[PDB]
Amino acid sequence: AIPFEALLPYGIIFGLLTAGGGAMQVLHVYRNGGVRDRFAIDQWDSQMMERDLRLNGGQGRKQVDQATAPEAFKHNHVWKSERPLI
Amino acid sequence: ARQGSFWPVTFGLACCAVEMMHVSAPRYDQDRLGIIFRASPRQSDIMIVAGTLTNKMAPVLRQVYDQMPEPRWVISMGSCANGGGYYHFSYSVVRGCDRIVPVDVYVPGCPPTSEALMYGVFQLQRKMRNTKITRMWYRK
Amino acid sequence: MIINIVEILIFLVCVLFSVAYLTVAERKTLAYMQRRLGPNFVGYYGLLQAFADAVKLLLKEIVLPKESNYIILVISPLITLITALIGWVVIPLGPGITLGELNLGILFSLAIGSLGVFGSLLSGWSSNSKYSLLGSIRSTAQLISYELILTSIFIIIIMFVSSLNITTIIETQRVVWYCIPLLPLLLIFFIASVAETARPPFDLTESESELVAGYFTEYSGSPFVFFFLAEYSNIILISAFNGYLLLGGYLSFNYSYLFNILFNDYSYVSFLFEGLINSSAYAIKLVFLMFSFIWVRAAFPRFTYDNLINFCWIILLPLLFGIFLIIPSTLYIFDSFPTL
Amino acid sequence: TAAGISLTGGRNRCFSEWQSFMHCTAKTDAKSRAQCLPNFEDYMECLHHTKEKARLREIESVLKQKKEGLEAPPVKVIPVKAIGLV
Amino acid sequence: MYLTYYFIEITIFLAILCTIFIISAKNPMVSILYMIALFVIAAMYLYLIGLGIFSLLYIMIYIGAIAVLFLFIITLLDINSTELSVKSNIRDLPLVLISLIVLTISGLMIYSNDSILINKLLEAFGNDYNTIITQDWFNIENTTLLTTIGNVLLTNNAFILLVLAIVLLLGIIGPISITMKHK
Amino acid sequence: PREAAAHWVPFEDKANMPDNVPDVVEVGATSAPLLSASYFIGAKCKPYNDDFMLCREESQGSGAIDCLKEGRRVTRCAVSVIEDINKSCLDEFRLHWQCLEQNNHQLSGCRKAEALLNKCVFTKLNLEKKIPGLRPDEEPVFLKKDPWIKPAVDDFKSVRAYAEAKKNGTL
Amino acid sequence: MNTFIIFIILIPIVGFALLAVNILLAVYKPYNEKLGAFECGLTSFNQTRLAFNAAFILVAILFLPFDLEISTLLPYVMSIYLVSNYGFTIVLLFLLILIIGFVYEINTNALKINKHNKPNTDSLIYK
Amino acid sequence: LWARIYLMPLLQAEEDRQTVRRSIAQLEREKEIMKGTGFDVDKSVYNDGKFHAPALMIPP
Amino acid sequence: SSSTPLVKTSVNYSYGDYPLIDADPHFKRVVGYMRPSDYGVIGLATAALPAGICFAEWLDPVKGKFARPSVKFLRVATMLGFAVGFGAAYARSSLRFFGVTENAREYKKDEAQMAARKAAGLEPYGTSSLTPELQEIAAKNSAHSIAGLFIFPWFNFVNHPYHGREQ
Amino acid sequence: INANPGFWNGPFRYLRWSAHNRPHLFFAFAIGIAGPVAALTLTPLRRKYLYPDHSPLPQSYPLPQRAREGLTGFDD
Ligand SMILES: CCCCCCCCCCCCCCCCCC(=O)OC[C@H](COP(=O)(O)OCCN)OC(=O)CCCCCCCCCCCCCCCCC
């Protein structure tokens, strides 16, 4: 019937790609801080992630919810200075 | 590493070449040993002179042997390939490839049984156990 | 900084192993198709055969013949190696799990498969022989001629998504796969995939040409291990392309109800379990596909170059023009254009 | 044609100055376009920023000559991983 | 942090360097390989300026079709070539130097509009001011650059796409019609 | 309008708005709370946002300085909406935007917490979530039953709360 | 520092390392009869230039005008929603202008190589 | 799409006030640099009377 | 909503003596309003191409002896003649919309048909399945394209709201 | 051996001959001609019977055409 010796290197390939994907997802979640990745990022979404990084204070996507923003928040606004492009 | 991968050039030319294709057959497999015929001497570890050697082919047999990279062996399959054989007293024959190429294992048999060719391969792999390439440089 | 270097280490070491055991699995299954065992003399059940080949192959010397440019002879393995290996970034092993997530990953996947032709053609001129050069001509002409219909199949699939991102395609695919509406496209993408690597249904160079061992006949050692790695990386890479745009990338079933039974909250065991399911689905797609490549190798003779060019340009490509016309017209007749 | 279409399909950076100049040329016959000069001057220096670079080198030549240098609310530069640090 | 500043200038220097190995290389196809390297330097500059889409269009179209065509020609055809001997091109060297100076400066001249000639050139070099990039929240969808090209090739300049179809047709008909030998 | 590329350097300025401009409270909500309360700040503050953009249209290139007085009021009224939605349903609002924290902030993946939040805000803050430009005999998409596009993983807290709201009969 | 550019820097160092372990660890030991190209165990003279068929060169000359269309269809496929009903017809006309040049190519049999293995068509008329 | 246009004026007013504040800060800073030697910091190089955000700053 | 031109447009800007009907007529209206002399022009050009080829062989034959041209050429002559007849037909009939030739026959038809669309409670120029920006761009493409009929055939199929006319 | 009748000698007999002996060209052209003929003749049937066309998506902030009436609230 079915030979285990033929399917054993396929068992290895299946296990290596499976353990690779599982370990990668755990590293992505540990990078975000317990939540999932953002798999497609708009210009609007990129500006919004920068705004959130300005809102919460330091941390990546802490995702605070407050009525009224703090006082360093009005002053920590950044402009981006781009070089000459010669 | 030199044993478990074991690549001969398929020089076999006559009676003893079909007997080599029984080492490729599904009863006496050679894939299960690690043997595959890379059919170019630039990649084969070893050569098998499997068949006769006439006087018209002795430079051709040497030019095929000249090319293979430097860890190289050769096994001489058959009785026509060691000492002329059945055609020993003939005008157009080389009395074995010992005159042309330096041979390490002689496999005797006029159709040397696929059992016996495989046994010659195991004998060559035993010669590869005691090659001592790195102990030699320590000057044992 | 520690977290991105350990992820790329683990993805490297998972892919560079899985291209080694592909060749072992190939000799195994090709043996059992032909009613004989594969290798079983090198590991407990024949495993780490490819490591025996590789460690011996690194010990053979490198010969550089007198007609050759020695640089070009050694740089075409490096560029074919890196080009067959750079394309492993953009595949997702789950939603937004890549090695660089960029907004246009198909255009990258399609520009790297364009860079792989050179290491054939350029390798023809190193050791310039008129019996070698013309074989490199035939190989390169076949290689580009089937890359055309490869690129075209891609653009027909991106008609449904209108986004060059790849995990966007796979998230789009959750409603239905793209193989089941577009069934003839699976068959012609499979045969164009078999062509693009020059597999031995569609080979002429390794066997039939005036060289006994293809365009890479005169080699030994590192220039052979790099080509050998690059061909099977190309195997699993075009298998990955089929895995995401035509079969489901990481998608198997819904698995919301099984989670609402098992789990209670988001935790690292839940992300681990979901990652195992997603990459298991992707791996079983990719493994059935490499088995299909090895399965079509077993049963068939090969092609004349005339048969090959008459196949691509006269048969498959007019049919493909009909496909270009019929599919946006079907998206047209019903009121459904895909939004960015 | 693509007269004022930007990279995102919007209006380009100097569209308003160009459309103001086109308002100026719409209501105006020839031999009276000499009044339409300041709209054109505004458009060309919107494109190339020539008067702006001239003014900035006029004030930069004074900036290097002071030993005091800067007595103002200063501009603080930050590294990219410190948008909302404090 | 400021190691990542001079990249553009590096590519300029690198691009300069590559052209000297194009025009002076003993083997032809080695110099065509240097041209492939120059396409790669161009695509580096196009990612570096902010146009990541084009870089992969250059690697697809120029490297993967035009260079493959060129290498494919040089293989199965006969081309003599002479080396860069000093004796044959030392007679060219003074007109080379004069044309380098004049064509370089005069290429740098028309970006500028003072009537005085020396003021035209110095405005070429006054770029060291850093443009300020401001965030405007007026755009709601990810219209990339390729989407906008597909909107302007297809509505406002559809006729240019259609005359372009006539050009691609001609690029099919022509090489065929030369290399047929009908009957 | 264009992205910063080739070694952009971020800089901030410690400075203050001048005397003649009054002070204004700014919004401290983040992308998932803001994307959650988007429809309700658009429902309460339609004429103020419209006044701002219409002023900014009528004074061309004036832009910044001459319609500042009205961009005060849009921020103030949206802060009013989010304070009221906090004090009304902090828990179910939180359930919604914590669902939106996963799934790429896709609104497609969080229907069952969205139903709870829309009911709670229509009951107490009496604002309704609507999609304009939608002519009749066209069903709004966050009302439909068996959509084609379902999320990968339903989050657990909102499935449990949705089943409990079924059992309570409030749904 | 994303993990995209570690990879494109990191594949080469692996390849350079494997090439280096071959150059360091294997012997070199060449001579003249080892050098020289391989053709089946026989040396021969190579001819300086050889002739070829026009279809061989025509495949890759003809390849590029079809490739340039396939990359011209790539701006449309991203903007297919915006140009509803209108850019559709323009892309139809573009593809049809291409298809008639393609049917020129397939009617001329440009890529086909004939065989001069004619079976002696002419019969035996005698005297 | 309707969610994002409901969010647009709320964020546009915030970036508006940042533009006004930092622009007036830059004008007053260049005024305090060029004190003494007569030079109009307040005059804008555009001939139109409308307000415009500064660009092209001195490398920090 | 899908009826606003959002443009400024010349109003009743006659191109000759006679008052204009449209600035570009739709293809359907041109095929509707063409005179029997226009179908005569079509028939003239269908008959003139094969008779022209047979004539031009009767002047100087191809192979030295006079034969008739094959039916293979007469079939393509008929096709290209219908093409010339239709191009001349469409151009003649569009001239009467522009007011450069006599259109007193067609102007009464347009009074009647614009009065019939008002009674039936529908748009004056058609509901089209395009956003108004695409209608404007599409009919900037199709405006006055009957000039340059020599280079390329181009027609109007978009139901866009402006045709150079009041109301 | 199978010879070409030509499209002109018999139309439907040529269509049958192309279907039996050149099936790649005949079906490539059949799949190609099924596209725009159906796009012409099947879409008004769909708009009359299956479902009418969707409403257009917004692209920017939708400005009304009004004249800034006074608003009360949030003065200070
Ligand atoms: C009404 C609607 C219209 C209906 C039609 C539908 C149209 C869409 C269908 C498209 C599917 C196309 C699939 C590819 C078709 C290839 C056609 C073909 O078989 O090649 C024909 C060719 C001979 O050409 P010819 O000259 O005409 O022969 C006449 C003999 N006197 O002979 C050859 O070239 C040799 C055959 C080569 C085939 C490649 C085989 C390689 C690999 C096979 C893949 C198998 C896949 C298995 C994968 C796993 C499956 C579980």
Ligand code: SF4
């Ligand atoms: S050794 Fe024996 S079987 Fe082999 S070729 Fe010679 S005679 Fe024949």
